[PDB]
Amino acid sequence: MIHELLLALSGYPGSIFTWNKRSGLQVSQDFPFLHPSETSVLNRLCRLGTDYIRFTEFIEQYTGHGGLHGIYLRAFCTGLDSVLQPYRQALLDLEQEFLGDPHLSISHVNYFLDQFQLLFPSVMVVVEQIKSQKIHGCQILETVYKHSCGGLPPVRSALEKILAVCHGVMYKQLSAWMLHGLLLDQHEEFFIKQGSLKQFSLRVEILPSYIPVRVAEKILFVGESVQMFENNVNLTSILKNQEDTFAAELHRLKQQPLFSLVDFEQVVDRIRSTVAEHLWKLMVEESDLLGQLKIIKDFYLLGRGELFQAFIDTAQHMLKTPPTAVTEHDVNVAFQQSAHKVLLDDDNLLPLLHLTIEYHGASGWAALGLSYKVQWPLHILFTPAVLEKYNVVFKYLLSVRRVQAELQHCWALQMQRKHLKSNQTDAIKWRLRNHMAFLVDNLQYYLQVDVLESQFSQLLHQINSTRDFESIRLAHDHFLSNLLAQSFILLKPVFHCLNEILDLCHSFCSLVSQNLLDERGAAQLSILVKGFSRQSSLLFKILSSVRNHQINSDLAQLLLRLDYNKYY
């Protein structure tokens, strides 16, 4: 009987301990020479060997080799296999004992194997959850971990050992990602996923729950930062052979028998800092971030005022109409001729700037944008969405500049001999023109000084008084976001008041040109002058807001009136 029992416990059903697929190992309940309590022991040993067989089957199926698969499974199986080994040893020990003592009793076998009878079925619950729910990849880690929390020193301990082996796969994936920007994750088991350039994100539904999202964000950041080294005419590691110091901290951790979150986070924090510091360096000290911001400000934020004025004047005739196939080309020449006209030297910046025209997919001005060809490594700051935003600011700025130019041109045209009347309308034109130019020069002064310069200023300060890249992204996002809010809240109503002044200007021009102290003439004349005066006063009121960086009632009601006109 002991022979058939030792065999069964080793994985070999026969004709006495038989195998039911449904229920596993069974024995007859009717041996006439067994006491009921011995049959009972045999029944309990049957469970013990039924688990052993079911483990072994599981292990064989997912090592060596849509249901279970992946490397986290394999490592789970490997850890299980290791956790079963003392049991195997016990069988080998029992087998020697039986050889030296053919009176080995059922009772003795049962007592010797007691520890395994306690251990096995906890561990089998883990196998079973895995099996029924198809637990995959890093989710296996969460399962083993939670049940590792289900106490009883030897089951907790078995499960810890399994976790550690499983964590071995994580540390491997981690250190490939964090230290070499690679994602070796054929089966989609890891909590960083992919999804030319390559995008990355968190797969949070697979993130082990004892690892906070906050910690995973950092791992995400480190690995992106690294993989973003795809420099073809040079070759610059953002680590150093600080690489090895880090390879070793991960290998160390991989060796811990117990998972420590504080410890793991310290290592993650330390790699992140370092990548952040080297990133700031790369940008500010070796790729002239400060210098490209300036270029961006010169172009997107019209900092080169004289070039855009020349540009608007030369391109007006080609942009006031709906674009055509040649517009973009014509407009870029006009833009290059304007830089020449204005003695713009730096022979090497205009190549890197191009004006775009939306053609196919109402006026050329509406279709116009600006595109900047960022270079490695700066595109990690100047992402395409960032440049999209600049570009929207650009169009609000350019619009205000253009309605100013047209206003200036409207007065100029009227000051020409053919429009002069040699009486009092002349001196009125003259006063209005000079007032409008005073107005506009002050709009531009405060728009530029209290808005652009001063925001740009803070940006540079923030950038200079930190050594962390993420502090730069942060300050930059605040800067760009404020520019957009000012475009919608200041530029737009400024543009609308100036454009109103412009209609009044054309109206004035057209009234004078009718060659009427006629009754209706002096009437019209006065309506027009109150127009200019009211628009002028409003712009001045708008300018305090510009100064306070708070919206005042005048600005608020004007924004309200403008939404009311659009909708009602």
Side-chain angles (χ1 to χ4, degrees), residues 1-20 23-46 48-59 61-64 66-130 132-133 135-155 157-171 173-197 200-231 237-239 241-347 349-357 359-466 468-515 518 520-529 531-567:
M1 180 78 58
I2 295 299
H3 166 71
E4 303 283 332
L5 173 65
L6 290 183
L7 262 179
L9 289 179
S10 294
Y12 295 85
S15 44
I16 304 302
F17 298 81
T18 58
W19 181 263
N20 179 251
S23 37
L25 247 14
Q26 290 166 338
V27 241
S28 175
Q29 304 302 281
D30 309 322
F31 282 110
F33 54 91
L34 289 181
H35 304 313
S37 71
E38 291 166 316
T39 286
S40 200
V41 169
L42 294 184
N43 279 339
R44 131 179 156 120
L45 293 168
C46 279
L48 175 67
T50 286
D51 284 352
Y52 181 72
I53 291 175
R54 285 196 300 214
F55 287 150
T56 289
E57 202 175 84
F58 186 68
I59 286 170
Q61 190 176 172
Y62 300 123
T63 59
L68 308 174
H69 61 295
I71 53 160
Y72 281 92
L73 187 51
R74 296 194 34 108
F76 175 79
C77 297
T78 292
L80 188 45
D81 205 25
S82 213
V83 144
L84 299 180
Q85 191 52 36
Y87 170 79
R88 292 190 199 101
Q89 189 50 51
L91 296 186
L92 297 168
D93 290 359
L94 279 175
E95 172 177 56
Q96 288 304 294
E97 268 207 69
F98 183 40
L99 279 187
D101 180 357
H103 300 157
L104 195 59
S105 56
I106 286 172
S107 243
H108 181 71
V109 162
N110 174 66
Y111 162 93
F112 201 72
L113 290 190
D114 187 45
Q115 65 180 126
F116 315 106
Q117 305 185 59
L118 299 167
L119 178 62
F120 285 21
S122 296
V123 178
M124 177 72 187
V125 296
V126 187
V127 169
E128 267 300 329
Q129 262 174 351
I130 295 174
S132 54
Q133 303 168 5
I135 313 205
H136 184 74
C138 282
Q139 267 318 97
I140 287 167
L141 296 160
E142 196 193 338
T143 300
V144 173
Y145 176 95
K146 307 270 222 181
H147 298 270
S148 172
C149 292
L152 307 179
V155 7
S157 171
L159 291 177
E160 296 164 356
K161 295 145 180 259
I162 297 187
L163 194 56
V165 169
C166 279
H167 276 151
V169 174
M170 202 190 51
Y171 284 120
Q173 283 191 316
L174 224 35
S175 115
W177 171 242
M178 293 185 95
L179 304 196
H180 294 66
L182 295 173
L183 256 206
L184 316 157
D185 194 12
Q186 182 192 348
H187 304 294
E188 292 186 5
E189 283 178 85
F190 190 43
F191 53 82
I192 303 299
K193 55 161 186 322
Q194 185 161 167
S196 192
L197 258 124
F200 299 98
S201 38
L202 283 196
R203 198 192 272 111
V204 110
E205 73 208 335
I206 216 162
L207 172 72
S209 72
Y210 47 97
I211 295 172
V213 175
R214 112 178 66 110
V215 177
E217 297 292 17
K218 309 192 191 179
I219 283 154
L220 173 57
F221 170 66
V222 170
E224 273 171 335
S225 297
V226 170
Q227 90 84 25
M228 135 305 226
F229 279 55
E230 66 203 304
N231 327 227
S237 130
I238 197 74
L239 304 146
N241 259 35
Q242 188 94 179
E243 182 160 344
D244 301 327
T245 308
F246 289 155
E249 281 294 271
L250 291 185
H251 184 265
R252 170 176 73 86
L253 280 181
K254 185 212 257 218
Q255 260 17 358
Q256 286 333 109
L258 294 182
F259 186 74
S260 176
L261 182 68
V262 326
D263 189 350
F264 170 89
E265 204 172 340
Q266 279 170 2
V267 173
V268 167
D269 283 342
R270 158 147 182 258
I271 296 171
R272 195 217 58 90
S273 287
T274 291
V275 174
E277 291 157 355
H278 301 184
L279 263 189
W280 184 110
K281 259 90 155 338
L282 177 64
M283 300 257 106
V284 171
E285 292 167 3
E286 317 173 23
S287 340
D288 187 36
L289 176 60
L290 292 202
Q292 309 276 312
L293 280 173
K294 172 66 164 21
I295 300 190
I296 263 148
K297 171 174 188 301
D298 285 344
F299 292 80
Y300 284 105
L301 285 6
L302 308 190
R304 284 188 179 278
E306 62 304 311
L307 164 61
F308 280 97
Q309 162 184 259
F311 170 78
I312 289 164
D313 174 75
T314 317
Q316 173 68 36
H317 73 288
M318 70 194 60
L319 282 173
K320 81 211 260 160
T321 41
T324 68
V326 299
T327 305
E328 168 165 336
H329 172 260
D330 286 344
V331 149
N332 288 273
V333 170
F335 189 63
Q336 295 163 327
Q337 290 312 312
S338 299
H340 287 145
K341 177 187 288 214
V342 112
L343 304 175
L344 178 26
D345 30 42
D346 199 329
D347 218 57
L349 103 212
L350 254 88
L352 152 140
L353 281 154
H354 174 82
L355 298 171
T356 60
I357 288 279
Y359 180 55
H360 290 324
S363 100
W365 287 110
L368 179 70
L370 172 60
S371 156
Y372 164 80
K373 290 44 176 95
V374 55
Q375 306 290 304
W376 192 96
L378 289 174
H379 61 325
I380 111 229
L381 180 73
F382 308 120
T383 63
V386 159
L387 299 176
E388 253 168 1
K389 284 183 182 136
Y390 276 118
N391 188 52
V392 161
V393 188
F394 175 68
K395 314 193 211 225
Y396 276 80
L397 285 167
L398 184 63
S399 254
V400 161
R401 207 41 205 85
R402 151 158 52 85
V403 73
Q404 294 171 179
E406 304 184 21
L407 180 56
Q408 159 169 69
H409 172 78
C410 175
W411 293 123
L413 167 184
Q414 281 176 71
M415 243 53 137
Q416 267 153 213
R417 211 183 47 125
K418 308 299 217 194
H419 289 273
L420 292 187
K421 296 291 130 149
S422 202
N423 63 14
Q424 231 41 197
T425 73
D426 292 359
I428 289 170
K429 282 177 190 306
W430 178 262
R431 277 188 302 268
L432 288 172
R433 167 185 179 148
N434 290 319
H435 182 77
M436 297 316 180
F438 166 78
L439 177 62
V440 164
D441 289 349
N442 277 280
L443 288 168
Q444 289 295 317
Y445 177 88
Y446 290 107
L447 259 4
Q448 290 171 11
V449 170
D450 290 355
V451 172
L452 310 170
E453 297 301 335
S454 144
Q455 282 290 121
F456 188 76
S457 224
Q458 304 170 214
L459 172 60
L460 290 198
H461 184 58
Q462 287 292 336
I463 296 185
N464 275 133
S465 81
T466 300
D468 191 335
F469 175 73
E470 278 184 271
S471 273
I472 294 186
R473 190 202 270 128
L474 200 85
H476 191 242
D477 276 343
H478 175 83
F479 172 80
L480 237 183
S481 184
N482 289 153
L483 295 179
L484 285 156
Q486 342 234 42
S487 311
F488 302 124
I489 301 310
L490 304 179
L491 309 178
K492 181 263 205 77
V494 169
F495 160 90
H496 172 104
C497 295
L498 293 172
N499 189 241
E500 184 66 48
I501 292 164
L502 174 67
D503 289 329
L504 292 173
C505 180
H506 285 304
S507 248
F508 189 92
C509 169
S510 168
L511 168 73
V512 164
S513 100
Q514 283 157 24
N515 289 344
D518 179 275
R520 270 168 300 205
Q524 311 280 39
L525 189 62
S526 219
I527 295 169
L528 299 174
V529 181
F532 285 115
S533 205
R534 139 164 176 73
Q535 299 312 319
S536 170
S537 187
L538 192 46
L539 283 163
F540 285 134
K541 314 237 205 59
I542 281 179
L543 275 182
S544 345
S545 281
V546 174
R547 287 269 256 157
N548 310 346
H549 313 270
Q550 295 201 155
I551 298 162
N552 65 32
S553 341
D554 284 303
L555 178 55
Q557 330 258 32
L558 166 64
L559 283 170
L560 167 70
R561 289 189 305 280
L562 296 173
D563 282 335
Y564 170 72
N565 287 324
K566 173 182 183 62
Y567 290 108

